[PDB]
């Protein structure tokens, strides 16, 4: 229950076992997401962490680590 | 494009914002069927229905048990006229009404004549008002119902409802009044007026379309044969799902009207006098249809000689008005209007939201365009050359 509840959200959203949600993985190229999935995934991170992620930041969150990094840097 | 002024409240009214506000919860979360007896969506819907029933009853001096909800005064008029006629038909076959009633009363009576009932269509005086002594004389031993409307929808004339009730009660004849144009605008009390049935329309009193009510007196009991068959809703008198948001809107409109009636009557009286006086002082040959001494001021029907009414409505391109109008006119004919003048009449409606500026704009355009259409009219040309139109052999 560290701020890699981020991993739990990504795995839940993309239908992927927690074992395959590696820090290096990009949602599309590595975890099978399309761009509808990635819209929903960004909103799921917004909800889970009570944070508003605007478009120019959302477009940079394309990997597990980028998600982890963004959330650690916004309390 | 800019919108025309609404001067046509006898045809229908806008919702009062207080009425839409009261309705909206029932269009959003309180959507239960008021006949659903086993859960809270039903309970809260039923409770709103019964509160609205009390609001309607309070406005007319009735017991809420005497209020039956309908889809409009058209349905209420059918229920009152056919329902009473059919109930008592084993002993009573004669009905009385008047020649200026709304079309749903007249056509209900015509359908009963095809059913073997006798119907007297009383004439009216040139004032538009019935002759009480002619009503008294028309009552027969098998007369079951008299129906006479409280305020006329075309010309605004007020019938002597309380005096009609005295006549009917004293002879044990049921008395129905179509009060669609009167409810919430002039005082109505079913006991002081000795009314046995009454029709009410929501959308003539700033409530929503698609709803109405019928008052049916319970003491002495008035009996009515139901017209709409079904599961017995509304005490077996009007089967069907009672539409909670609409009856909420009807009750709210009645409560608002009970509060606003005196204020509106004062304000509309002043605007009505202003409209009539300012038109008549500026145009010759303008006549009011209906006696101004027995008249609801928000409904003003005037004839403009030598101009045809529909062309005047066209000319008044930015004012919404009506002519020959069921909310060549059979009402104007019944009060003895010359046929040509009846083709020259239009109806102006002043309501709760009408402004002095609207009245003044309407007056000014009416003066301008009557003059213009007269200058285009061969009848005005002939009269200006001193010709007696009553001497020409037409066609």
């Amino acid at each position: 229950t560290i701020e890699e509840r981020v991993k739990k959200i990504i795995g839940e959203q993309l239908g992927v076992k927690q074992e395959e949600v590696t820090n290096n993985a990009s949602f599309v190229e590595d975890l099978g997401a399309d761009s509808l999935d990635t819209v929903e995934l960004v909103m799921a991170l917004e909800e889970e962490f009570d944070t508003e992620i605007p478009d120019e930041e959302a477009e940079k969150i394309t990997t597990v680590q980028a998600a982890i990094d963004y959330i650690n840097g916004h309390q | 494009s800019l919108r025309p002024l609404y001067m046509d409240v006898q045809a229908t009214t806008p919702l009062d914002p207080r009425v839409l506000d009261a309705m909206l919860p029932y269009l959003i979360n309180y959507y239960g069927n008021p006949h659903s007896r086993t859960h809270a969506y039903g309970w809260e819907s039923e409770a709103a229905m019964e509160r609205a029933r009390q609001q309607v009853a309070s406005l007319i001096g009735a017991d809420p048990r005497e209020i039956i909800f309908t889809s409009g005064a058209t349905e209420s008029n059918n229920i009152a006229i056919k329902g009473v006629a059919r109930f008592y038909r084993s002993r009573k076959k004669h009905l009385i009404t008047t020649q200026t009633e709304h079309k749903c009363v007249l056509d209900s009576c015509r359908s009963l004549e095809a059913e073997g009932f006798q119907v007297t269509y009383l004439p009216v005086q040139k004032s538009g008002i019935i002759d009480l002594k002619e009503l008294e004389a028309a009552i027969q031993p098998d007369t079951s119902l008299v129906s006479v409307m409280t305020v006329n929808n075309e010309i605004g004339v007020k019938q002597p409802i309380a005096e009609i009730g005295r006549i009917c009660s004293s002879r044990k004849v049921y008395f129905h009044t179509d009060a669609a144009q009167a409810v919430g605008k002039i005082p109505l009390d079913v006991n002081d007026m000795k009314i046995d049935l009454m029709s009410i329309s929501g959308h003539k009193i700033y409530g929503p379309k698609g709803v109405g009510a019928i008052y049916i007196r319970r003491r002495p009991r008035v009996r009515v044969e139901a017209l709409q068959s079904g599961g017995g809703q509304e005490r077996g008198m009007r089967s069907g799902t009672v539409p909670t948001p609409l009856v909420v809107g009807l009750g709210a409109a009645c409560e608002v009207a009970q509060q606003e009636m005196e204020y509106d009557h004062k304000r509309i009286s002043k605007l009505s006098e202003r409209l009539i006086q300012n038109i008549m002082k500026s145009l010759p040959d303008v006549v009011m249809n209906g006696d101004p001494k027995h008249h609801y001021p928000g409904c003003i029907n005037l004839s403009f000689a030598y101009v045809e009414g529909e062309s005047l409505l066209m000319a008044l391109k930015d004012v919404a008005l009506s002519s020959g109008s069921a909310c060549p006119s059979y009402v104007l004919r019944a009060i003895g209007t010359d046929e040509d003048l009846a083709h020259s009449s239009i109806r102006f409606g002043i309501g709760r939201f009408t402004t002095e500026e609207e009245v003044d704009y309407t007056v000014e355009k009416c003066i301008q365009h009557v003059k213009r259409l007269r200058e285009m009219s061969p009848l005005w040309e002939m009269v200006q050359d001193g010709i007696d139109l009553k001497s020409i052999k037409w066609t």
């Binding site: - | 919108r3 939201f353 009408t354």
Partner: protein, 84 residues
Amino acid sequence: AASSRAQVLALYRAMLRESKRFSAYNYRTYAVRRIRDAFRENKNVKDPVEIQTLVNKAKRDLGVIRRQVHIGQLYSTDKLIIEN
């Protein structure tokens, strides 16, 4: 205890200011006129209970005005000919 005079004058300003936001001419002009006429009609009521009833009705009507102004803005239409 609340001040009836303070409530009343604050409600008067609030109800007039909000009614002036009605998009529709006939509701706006009616609401402003009706509020002015009603407060003036009731100016000389002295019974503290009856004053409180009037104040409570005005608070209810202020909620109605606020909601119906917003709904009328969501579903607005063109102005009338005479607003030109």
